[PDB]
Amino acid sequence: MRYTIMVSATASDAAPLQFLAPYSGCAMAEYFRDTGKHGLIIYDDLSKQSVAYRQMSLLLRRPPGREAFPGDVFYLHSRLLERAAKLSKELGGGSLTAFPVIETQAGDVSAYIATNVISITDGQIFLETELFYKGIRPALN
Amino acid sequence: MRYTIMVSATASDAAPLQFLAPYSGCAMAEYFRDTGKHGLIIYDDLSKQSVAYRQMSLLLRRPPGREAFPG
Amino acid sequence: ALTGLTVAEYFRDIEGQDVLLFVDNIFRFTQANSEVSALLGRIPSAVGYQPTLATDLGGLQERITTTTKGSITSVQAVYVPADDLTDPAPATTFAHLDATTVLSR
Amino acid sequence: ALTGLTVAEYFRDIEGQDVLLFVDNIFRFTQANSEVSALLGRIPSAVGYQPTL
Amino acid sequence: ALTGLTVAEYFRDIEGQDVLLFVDNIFRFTQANSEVSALLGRIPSAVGYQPTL
Amino acid sequence: SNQAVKQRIRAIKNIGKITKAMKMVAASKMKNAQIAVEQSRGLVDPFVRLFGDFPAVNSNKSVVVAVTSDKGLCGGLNSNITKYTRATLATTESEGKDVVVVSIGDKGRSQLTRIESQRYQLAIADTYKVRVTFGQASLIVEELIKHNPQSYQILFNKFRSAISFKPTVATILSPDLLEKQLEDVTGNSLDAYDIEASHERSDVLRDLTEFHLGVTLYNAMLENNCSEHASRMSAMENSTKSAGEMLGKLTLDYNRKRQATITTELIEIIAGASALM
Amino acid sequence: SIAELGIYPAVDPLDSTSRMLNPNVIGAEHYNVARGVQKVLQDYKNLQDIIAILGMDELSEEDKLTVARARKIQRFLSQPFQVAEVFTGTPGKYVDLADTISGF
């Protein structure tokens, strides 16, 4: 915690606070990216930022799409995870590394929010549930 | 081509033109039915006409039904 | 389910005890909140639940914690609709559960 | 995607030569019009897309 | 279907006899009601049908 | 479509219950056929110490027998020995000899004419229907002495355990033209025996290799019958398992299509109520 | 489903269509190799469920000839790309059109 910021928007918080906390956290870590330093960010459960943003859109009477998600639920994570960059030497050379976390349901990586972030992020660390109960931990597929 | 009419409302055309082109083509083909000759009308992508008719009807604010198609 | 919490939150915050709250069928708490959001005209989310499914459950379940004065421990009976664990009413409920006790015939 | 064609349409119509147009994810043209069309006051089409897809 | 039934209800009531009524595609009676019911100001029921199905 | 997986689910749910029944009938058949293999295994070995075991002999006529199963859901048993049947009918054939090919079981004729079409002569089948007896194997032996070869080759799967079934080649030399000639090693190896028959040694050997042929045929098709029930007990252990994993992936995909159907039907009801209200 | 088998480019050969796949356009023997490859891959696609639950050892010999041929043309449709050398290590291969017709 000497190097960690913790931006928490829990389950009891209002849905616009859970929608915002990935952006509030990424602005805090972009301080280190922009001043030449290096940053790590973990948005644990971007699966739950989507449900907070689906709640705001459906309470705004906005027309829903795949799995009742708004049409801009791609852009929600898209403009968030594009801010994790590696800057040039003329901009400082700082970097921000993102680790978004998506919870699937039955290993379904072809879900809507899951496939959205797979087309945003560079890599993918798929953690398998059958390897996890066989004691293989970290249960990396 | 000496026996064929080609009625062509392509994808760049307005949705009312693709909605009406099956009827425009049938009315041309109904000239041969009504004068004792024989016609053969082929409505290629009648699925794409109903997509144009759904578009034209959701914008006229007529309320959608199953797969957002009109009643 | 909020009324049963408040009786249990007194025994935690004022009496300073370890309390057992039994929510009999947490699924019927979900589906009764899904009914009142439909009566208030709100547009339902996926499979038919309220748009505030995670924050209605989260508003209930986050009052069941250990504070510095005592704790509420909650034993909640879990109904699984259509024998589908990926349904949003158990899949949001399972985010909060710390243990399951399966009673089999 | 329309700015990209206008560069490519100039070389086709005016310069009159063979060009290659690589458009990475022309779906993102369709998805972007579907985000705007929720706010342009339209009844949504099938699975949530704009009526003029 | 209501016109074809009235012709048979006359033979049943006024002439008092055993009538046969063959109705081909009674599905279309319900289908044609649903083709107008959205324009009659009714919010849709299930599979596409009118609430008064 | 969403019923196309609902009908596919109940189909694979019954395959995994049918092939769990076929596995347990094959396990009950294998336990009471195992008690007959060892009682048949005894009579085989006084002949192979009296007549030796000479598989690669210079015969001029042979009858090769590949004894297989009748039913074909046993899983890589009946084609395993036709791999070995061509492995011996290319090993013996270095001298231009005659070969008559005989198969026991319907899965043998259906796979021997695929490799060996012209020297195939006889097909025995429906052997295993009630049980395998010695009187049945004696008649099957007798039409192998209708042809008068210099040798016989029997190809069967020997029931070692419920896991291993090593394919065996069993060889019977026919009596006074080739059996004693392979025994002509420093005089004769058969001269030590004092023949207490009624007629001569060349005539007791006729009765003895026919008895040797009927015993190693009865044991061949009794070893192979329960090497088939053990192979059917594991071919339906991979089937009940694979149709339970297929049913697992099919109920998960139905439940995605179940949930996506309720959201689709609901969004179309909200979009139609919002167009009016 | 093709990419998880490791076949790259993960092209579905029974979903990829062209208007150039026409015997008057590409030629007679190019068109026949292409339709011949798609017939072996479709026949193996029809055998996938019975191979899944009964196994390889229960098909006909005529069937398990095409299972082994379609498993060969499934792998042979894959190819190392010259732009994938940075994360795969295998050098890329520009296959000529005559080399893939007579190869297939």
PDB file of C-alpha atoms in Angstrom, chain C residues 5 7-21 63-74:
ATOM      1  CA  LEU C   5     -32.121  -7.002   9.157  1.00  0.00           C
ATOM      2  CA  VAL C   7     -34.026  -6.465  14.256  1.00  0.00           C
ATOM      3  CA  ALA C   8     -30.713  -8.202  13.626  1.00  0.00           C
ATOM      4  CA  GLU C   9     -28.803  -4.935  13.284  1.00  0.00           C
ATOM      5  CA  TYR C  10     -29.886  -3.918  16.764  1.00  0.00           C
ATOM      6  CA  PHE C  11     -28.375  -7.052  18.228  1.00  0.00           C
ATOM      7  CA  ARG C  12     -25.147  -6.259  16.417  1.00  0.00           C
ATOM      8  CA  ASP C  13     -24.888  -2.505  16.905  1.00  0.00           C
ATOM      9  CA  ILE C  14     -26.430  -2.092  20.374  1.00  0.00           C
ATOM     10  CA  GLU C  15     -26.186  -5.482  22.058  1.00  0.00           C
ATOM     11  CA  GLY C  16     -22.861  -6.327  20.395  1.00  0.00           C
ATOM     12  CA  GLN C  17     -23.604  -9.933  19.464  1.00  0.00           C
ATOM     13  CA  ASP C  18     -23.076 -12.490  16.725  1.00  0.00           C
ATOM     14  CA  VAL C  19     -26.496 -12.721  15.102  1.00  0.00           C
ATOM     15  CA  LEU C  20     -27.936 -15.281  12.697  1.00  0.00           C
ATOM     16  CA  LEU C  21     -30.261 -13.824  10.090  1.00  0.00           C
ATOM     17  CA  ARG C  63     -25.699  -4.768   5.704  1.00  0.00           C
ATOM     18  CA  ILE C  64     -24.806  -8.326   6.716  1.00  0.00           C
ATOM     19  CA  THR C  65     -21.167  -7.893   7.751  1.00  0.00           C
ATOM     20  CA  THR C  66     -18.896  -8.023  10.766  1.00  0.00           C
ATOM     21  CA  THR C  67     -18.489  -4.609  12.290  1.00  0.00           C
ATOM     22  CA  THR C  68     -16.308  -3.796  15.266  1.00  0.00           C
ATOM     23  CA  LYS C  69     -19.300  -4.223  17.607  1.00  0.00           C
ATOM     24  CA  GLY C  70     -20.615  -7.594  16.481  1.00  0.00           C
ATOM     25  CA  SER C  71     -21.647  -9.457  13.350  1.00  0.00           C
ATOM     26  CA  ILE C  72     -24.661 -10.635  11.421  1.00  0.00           C
ATOM     27  CA  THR C  73     -24.215 -14.010   9.760  1.00  0.00           C
ATOM     28  CA  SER C  74     -26.847 -14.841   7.192  1.00  0.00           C
TER      29      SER C  74
END
